[PDB]
Structure formats: C-alpha cells, structure tokens
Enzyme design. Structure first.
Site, PDB file in Angstrom:
ATOM      1  N   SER A 146       0.819  -1.227   0.000  1.00 56.46           N
ATOM      2  CA  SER A 146       0.000   0.000   0.000  1.00 56.46           C
ATOM      3  C   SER A 146       0.868   1.301   0.000  1.00 56.46           C
ATOM      4  O   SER A 146       1.658   1.513  -0.894  1.00 56.46           O
ATOM      5  CB  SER A 146      -1.049  -0.068   1.142  1.00 56.46           C
ATOM      6  OG  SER A 146      -0.569   0.467   2.358  1.00 56.46           O
ATOM      7  N   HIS A 248      -8.789   0.793   0.187  1.00 61.31           N
ATOM      8  CA  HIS A 248      -8.626  -0.143  -0.937  1.00 61.31           C
ATOM      9  C   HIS A 248      -9.967  -0.646  -1.398  1.00 61.31           C
ATOM     10  O   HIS A 248     -10.228  -1.845  -1.512  1.00 61.31           O
ATOM     11  CB  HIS A 248      -7.545  -1.224  -0.647  1.00 61.31           C
ATOM     12  CG  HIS A 248      -6.179  -0.624  -0.519  1.00 61.31           C
ATOM     13  ND1 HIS A 248      -5.449  -0.174  -1.610  1.00 61.31           N
ATOM     14  CD2 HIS A 248      -5.471  -0.270   0.578  1.00 61.31           C
ATOM     15  CE1 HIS A 248      -4.337   0.395  -1.182  1.00 61.31           C
ATOM     16  NE2 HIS A 248      -4.307   0.321   0.135  1.00 61.31           N
TER      17      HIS A 248
END
Length: 371
Positions: A146, A248
C-alpha cells in the site's frame, strides 16, 4: 543499544569454526561494555570480502555464547546456512544470498489519523533507505505494501526523498477525508477464493490479499455485517479492524482527484531497480506512476502475488514495525525487520546482521559509530 551486533567471518567453514570457538572463549562472562569492545573490534576486522559469515544480534555475553554454540553445532553437522530471524542469528558459508526489501504501509507504528500516520511512516522508511545507502546494500528488488509502494519507488530511484515525503503528506490528507457513510475493513482467516465467496452479493470487496490465510475485505458497515454473518455461518474467523475508512475499495474514489493532482506535479523517473508492485501484482515495467497510484486507492493490495514474485532467500523489512515480516513468515518466507525509527535497536541489530550474513553489505562498522 539494548542489542549488540556481533559479526565475524573467515575464508571457509573450517576456519570459521576455529574463529567462533575463539570468540566463544573470549565471550564468557564479559560485561556489557567489554562485549561492546569485542563486537566493535570484530566489525572492524571482518569487513570486505568475507567468504563465510556469522552475524548475531544479542542482548548480552550469554546471548552471544548461545548463538555461537548454535552456529558451531550447525557447522559441526556440515551445515552451511542457518537463518533464524526470530532469534537474530544468521550463518552463511558460500553466500551471497538473494535479499529483497519489504516496505510497510499504514497500520504500521507511528485509530491514528491517516493524514499524520502516512508521512510519519514514510519518513521512517526513507531513514531506513539512508541506512541501507550508508551500508552500500545490494538487494535484488523491493515490494511496498500500500503506502509502502511510495517508499519502494523512492528506493528504486523513481522519485527523490523530499518529493516522496511530500507525496505521502498529500496522500494522507486526501485519504483522511470521511467516506460518504460509516465504513471499515474486516480481516478474514481464509484464502482469496473463500473471501470472494463470503463477499459475493454483499457489496463488500477484497481490499488486501495478504496470503493463503489472511484476506481483508472493505465496505460500508452494512456490507461488512453481511460478510460477518456469512463468515460465522461458514466457520471462517472474521476480525474487525480498528479503522474508520474502507481503504482499498471504491469508497476511496473521491481521494483520486486530489491525489492525481499532487502526484501529476512531480518529476517522476523510470525505476532503476526491480519493484514488485502490490497494485499490479507484477514487476513494475514502465508504468505511468500517476495512473498506478490513483488506482491503488480503490483497487486491492496484491501482496500475496508481489511477494511470490520477489525471489529472495531473505527479506528485510525497511520501515517501522514488523508487520510485513510477520506476513512473509506466514507465507513460509524468512524475514526480519529493521524496525526503522523504533526506540529499541533490536531491529537495527537483527536486520543489519541479516544483511551482513547474507552478503548484501560488506561492512557492519557503521553500527558502532557515534553512540
């Protein structure tokens, strides 16, 4: 430091047994300052082309005696490779080994405001990259989970450190905005197909594909409730995460306009070192970094696939915490964290030991400078 780094080496296994036996004798009942002198002297003397290598991160002389007994026993049995990240002990005859880097995302040590967490984490990772620079480290490639992808890209030379940290602020600012409605994430102890089955028709989507027994889904609170019902019915353990956003997931799309603006202004360069993307799940190959970073907000983190691509005997996590090392160990990989920015030198010692033993760095002396 609370852990000492003790390295040494020799031209071969037989010679290394001889040396470790002398060091074990010299080690018994040393006080803390005498252990430091011993370790500093060994680091000065055992650097450069050191064919067979021992390195251990130890709390005290008795911890060193124990590590030497283990290394000696391994050699005595014809062993040429002992990597125990959990005990900070590394022995390698006939290296170098291939070493890959792991850059952590949030949920990493600084629920915290993501606007603060993001650039704090990235600052710790960039300091870890300065450490690897100081040591002349030669990893085969990197992966960032990420937010960590920004640090992997900076390590790879796609963006300088100042710009990377500026991007992480802007990213954390864009993403801390409240979703339209209450939303969050739910961690499932199950593989990707099981998570997709539990999520099918609920509104929740895969957010993080960590491994064969860790997949996280994200959605609004009603969506996650439906997955939680389904998981209890299927006997899958489902753990709520303490976050306030469905990261996400499509709920992050409003953050795109802002992040696209910030990233479009930067002097992006082609990465010069390999990066296994957790956005594409593939090696980075001349991607447009802006498009990749924008779709990273709404798309899943492909950590399982990225890790699978990184062919490395040892992984070193370069950032705060040891979360990605715990994930790599969950995939049966060997991993140790530098725990960059931690109060305790535990991780700096163990991760530098691992680098030296694997042959990724030639010189541990910078561990002993300016205390």
């Amino acid at each position: 430091p609370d852990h000492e780094l003790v390295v040494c080496g020799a031209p071969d296994a037989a010679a290394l047994t001889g040396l470790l036996t002398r060091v074990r004798a010299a080690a018994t009942a040393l006080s803390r300052p005498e252990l430091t002198d011993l370790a500093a002297g060994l680091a000065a003397a055992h650097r450069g082309d050191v064919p067979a290598r021992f390195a251990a991160a130890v709390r005290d002389a008795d911890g060193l005696v124990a590590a030497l007994d283990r290394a000696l026993g391994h050699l005595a049995e014809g062993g040429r490779r002992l990597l125990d990240a959990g005990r900070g002990l590394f022995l390698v005859v006939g290296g170098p080994l291939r070493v890959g880097l792991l850059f952590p995302g949030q949920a990493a040590p600084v629920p915290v405001d993501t606007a603060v967490a993001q650039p704090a984490i990235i600052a710790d990772s960039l300091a870890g990259i300065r450490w690897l620079d100081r040591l002349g480290a030669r990893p085969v490639g990197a992966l960032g989970h990420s937010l960590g992808e920004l640090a992997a890209l900076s390590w790879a030379g796609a963006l300088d450190a100042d710009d990377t940290l500026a991007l992480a602020r802007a990213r954390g600012e864009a993403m801390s905005v409240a979703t339209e409605a209450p939303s969050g994430m739910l961690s499932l102890r199950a593989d990707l197909a099981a998570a997709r089955e539990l999520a099918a028709g609920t509104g929740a989507v895969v957010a993080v594909d960590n491994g064969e027994r860790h997949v996280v889904v994200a959605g609004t609170r009603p969506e996650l409730d439906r997955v939680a019902e389904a998981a209890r019915h299927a006997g899958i353990e489902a753990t709520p995460l303490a976050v306030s956003h469905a990261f996400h997931s499509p709920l992050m799309a409003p953050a795109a306009e802002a992040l696209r603006r910030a990233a479009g202004r930067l002097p992006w360069r082609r990465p010069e070192r390999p990066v296994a993307s957790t956005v594409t799940g593939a090696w980075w190959a001349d991607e447009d970094p802006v498009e990749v970073l924008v779709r990273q907000l709404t798309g899943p983190v492909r950590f399982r696939e990225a890790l699978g691509l990184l062919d490395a005997d040892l992984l070193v996590e370069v950032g705060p915490g040891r979360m990605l090392s715990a994930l790599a160990e969950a995939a049966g990989r060997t991993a140790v964290s530098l725990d960059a920015g931690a109060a305790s030198a535990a991780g700096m010692a163990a991760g530098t030991a691992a680098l030296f033993a694997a042959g990724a760095v030639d010189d541990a002396t910078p561990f002993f400078a300016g205390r």
